[PDB]
Scaffold this active site. Structure first.
Site, PDB file in Angstrom:
ATOM      1  N   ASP A 429       0.796  -1.222   0.000  1.00  0.00           N
ATOM      2  CA  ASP A 429       0.000   0.000   0.000  1.00  0.00           C
ATOM      3  C   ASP A 429       0.835   1.282   0.000  1.00  0.00           C
ATOM      4  O   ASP A 429       0.370   2.344  -0.413  1.00  0.00           O
ATOM      5  CB  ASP A 429      -0.943  -0.024   1.196  1.00  0.00           C
ATOM      6  CG  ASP A 429      -1.883  -1.203   1.149  1.00  0.00           C
ATOM      7  OD1 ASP A 429      -2.109  -1.712   0.038  1.00  0.00           O
ATOM      8  OD2 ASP A 429      -2.391  -1.622   2.206  1.00  0.00           O
ATOM      9  N   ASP A 446       1.299  -1.496   4.876  1.00  0.00           N
ATOM     10  CA  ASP A 446       0.067  -2.127   4.432  1.00  0.00           C
ATOM     11  C   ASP A 446      -1.022  -1.631   5.380  1.00  0.00           C
ATOM     12  O   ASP A 446      -0.840  -1.658   6.596  1.00  0.00           O
ATOM     13  CB  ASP A 446       0.172  -3.654   4.531  1.00  0.00           C
ATOM     14  CG  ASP A 446       0.438  -4.319   3.193  1.00  0.00           C
ATOM     15  OD1 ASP A 446       0.728  -3.610   2.203  1.00  0.00           O
ATOM     16  OD2 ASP A 446       0.364  -5.568   3.136  1.00  0.00           O
ATOM     17  N   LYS A 448      -5.406  -1.412   6.509  1.00  0.00           N
ATOM     18  CA  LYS A 448      -6.630  -2.210   6.465  1.00  0.00           C
ATOM     19  C   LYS A 448      -7.767  -1.652   7.331  1.00  0.00           C
ATOM     20  O   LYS A 448      -7.607  -1.430   8.540  1.00  0.00           O
ATOM     21  CB  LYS A 448      -6.309  -3.661   6.868  1.00  0.00           C
ATOM     22  CG  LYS A 448      -7.512  -4.598   6.936  1.00  0.00           C
ATOM     23  CD  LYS A 448      -7.780  -5.283   5.602  1.00  0.00           C
ATOM     24  CE  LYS A 448      -9.244  -5.729   5.487  1.00  0.00           C
ATOM     25  NZ  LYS A 448     -10.187  -4.646   5.011  1.00  0.00           N
TER      26      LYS A 448
END
EC number: 3.1.21.4
Length: 558
Positions: A429, A446, A448
């Site tokens: 990401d 990353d 989420k």
């Protein structure tokens, strides 16, 4: 509880009209629908007899249900049956709702709270009998939209002759930053477009968008067809290349006249603008409480003159709403951002506009998430308040993308990192690094969005091991996109980070395992600590070398 004032999906103006001509007892469509479409497409006899009957009353009034119905599907209602599909012979309960929201937004029908019903209005009937393509129907349409704040707001943003994309407009549209009014950083989106395959460029150029970007494209398209704005692609030079955005607009001569008069610089009064409690908040968990708070601030500004935030806060408190000055300030930027004119001169605010009477229904405990928003707005004196909205956005699964971009943007803009947001199934990401630090390091990130508290499934820890090792091995055959090139060659020390609303469970065991396999240090970071750590970088009590040492294979707490 309903939601109005904002439409996201396309529809034909020819279909909007039909929807309106159904509340008018003396129109062709009204008869056509109740006398042909319904008995035909509406099979289940019972509802069928209930609907034509309802369309048969002298003084027509329809409830939300009667108009929208339910879906999964068969024909369940009036709107459904008066509009055919883009191929059934009728539309679903989702598109029916957009049309209802659209008719209501331009003022052709009014909503009666508590009765959950609608009726046609003064301008709606005139719209109804208006000849198709006539100059009068157009007149009615432009007057209708001028009473619509967001349209006025889109016009204000283009007043200087600027050429902007839906993203450049979306960021200053509605209650910016919060869920329901999100916008994707243009620069960041063009990057994903420049390095994308020609087979996916189109979907990214037009379907990659935040809520406000959606509204800006829709409202902008309405104004284009009415001649107040001009839609034309904007071009860019994006080196991996050239790229363009087709959803770009630019004001016109007729558009400035409409804006000029809406500002109050003309010989004629402005068109009174319609504002309703249901438009002051959309996809916000605490939209009922928040909608009221913003409604009551509007009222105070209305019946008052020049005021100081402390007096507004004071007047607000009397009503039983204990708010902090910066929550009230953010609530005002949103009012301004949706089309209402509130001048701010130094320490004084003063509304200078013409708004009609709207009702605050049922006239409520603040939820824990909003109290947290309030705490951080009145605490983080350097963090652009919009970022505090990530705490709620991070709890919604449907919001990974904006979470993606907004987190990377905070890293670079507030923390001071270099690098960028990547994303996709083959890239992390984001990849950030430092320059000039005692030890210049890189970070593999990353993110989420998840509701409840991420325990770090082995699946996501699995995807991160792949990025950390690919940056170690760096084989172009294993990964042809050589994403690792983002980093300066001199960088040799790397870290891995997982960012989410908040963590719980045995996420640590995952960190211990990844550190053992790759030998890199990592950590987990709650969004609230991201913000806390960013306000420190700015307050001066935290350095990028101090962050480095935070990666201890556990949770980082600044």
């Amino acid at each position: 509880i309903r939601t109005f004032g904002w439409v996201q999906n396309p529809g034909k103006f020819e279909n909007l009209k039909r929807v309106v001509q159904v509340f008018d007892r003396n129109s062709k469509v009204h008869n056509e629908v109740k006398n042909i479409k319904i008995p035909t497409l509406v099979k289940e006899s019972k509802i069928q007899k209930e609907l034509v009957a309802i369309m048969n009353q002298h003084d027509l009034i329809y409830t939300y249900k009667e108009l929208v119905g339910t879906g999964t599907a068969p024909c369940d209602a009036i709107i459904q049956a008066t509009i055919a599909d883009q191929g059934k012979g009728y539309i679903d309960n989702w598109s029916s709702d957009g049309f209802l929201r659209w008719a209501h937004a331009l003022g052709f029908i009014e909503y009666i709270n508590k009765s959950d019903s609608f009726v046609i209005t003064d301008v709606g009937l005139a719209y109804s009998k208006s000849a198709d393509g006539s100059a009068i129907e157009k007149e009615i349409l432009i007057e209708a939209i001028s009473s619509y704040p967001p349209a006025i707001r889109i016009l204000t943003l283009l007043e200087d002759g600027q050429h902007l994309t839906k993203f450049d407009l979306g960021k200053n549209l509605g209650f910016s930053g919060e869920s329901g009014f999100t916008s994707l950083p243009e620069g960041i989106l063009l990057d994903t477009l420049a390095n994308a395959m020609p087979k996916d460029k189109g979907e990214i150029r037009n379907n990659w968008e935040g809520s406000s970007d959606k509204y800006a494209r829709m409202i902008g398209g309405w104004l284009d067809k009415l001649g107040l704005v001009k839609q034309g692609k904007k071009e860019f030079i994006i080196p991996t290349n050239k790229e363009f955005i087709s959803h770009a607009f630019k004001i016109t001569g007729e558009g400035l006249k409409v804006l000029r008069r809406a500002k109050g610089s003309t010989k004629f009064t402005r068109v009174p603008k319609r504002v309703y409690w249901e438009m002051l908040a959309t996809n916000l968990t605490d939209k009922e409480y928040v909608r009221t708070r913003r409604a009551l601030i509007l009222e105070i500004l209305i019946k008052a003159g020049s005021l100081k935030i402390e007096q507004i806060q004071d007047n607000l408190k009397k009503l039983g709403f204990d708010e902090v000055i910066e929550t009230i300030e953010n609530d005002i930027k949103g009012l301004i951002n949706t089309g209402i004119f509130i001048e701010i001169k130094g320490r004084f605010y003063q509304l200078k506009d013409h708004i009609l009477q709207f009702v605050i229904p049922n006239r409520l405990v603040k939820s824990e998430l909003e109290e947290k928003k309030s705490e951080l707005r009145h605490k983080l004196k350097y963090v652009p308040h919009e970022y505090i909205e990530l705490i709620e956005i991070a709890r919604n699964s449907t919001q990974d993308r904006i979470l993606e971009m907004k987190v990377m943007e905070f890293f670079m803009k507030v923390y001071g990192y270099r690098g960028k947001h990547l994303g996709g199934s083959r890239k992390p990401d984001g990849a950030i690094y430092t320059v000039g630090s005692p030890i210049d390091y890189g970070v593999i990130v990353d993110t989420k969005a998840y509701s409840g508290g991420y325990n770090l499934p082995i699946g996501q820890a699995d995807e991160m091991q792949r990025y950390v090792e690919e940056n170690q091995t760096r084989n172009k055959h294993i990964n042809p996109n050589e994403w690792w090139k983002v980093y300066p060659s001199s960088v040799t020390e790397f870290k891995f980070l997982f960012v989410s609303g908040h963590f719980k469970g045995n996420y640590k065991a995952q960190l211990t395992r990844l550190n053992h396999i790759t030998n890199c240090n990592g950590a987990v970071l709650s969004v609230e600590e991201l913000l806390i750590g960013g306000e420190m970088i700015k307050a001066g009590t935290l350095t990028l070398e101090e962050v480095r040492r935070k990666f201890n294979n556990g949770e980082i707490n600044f």
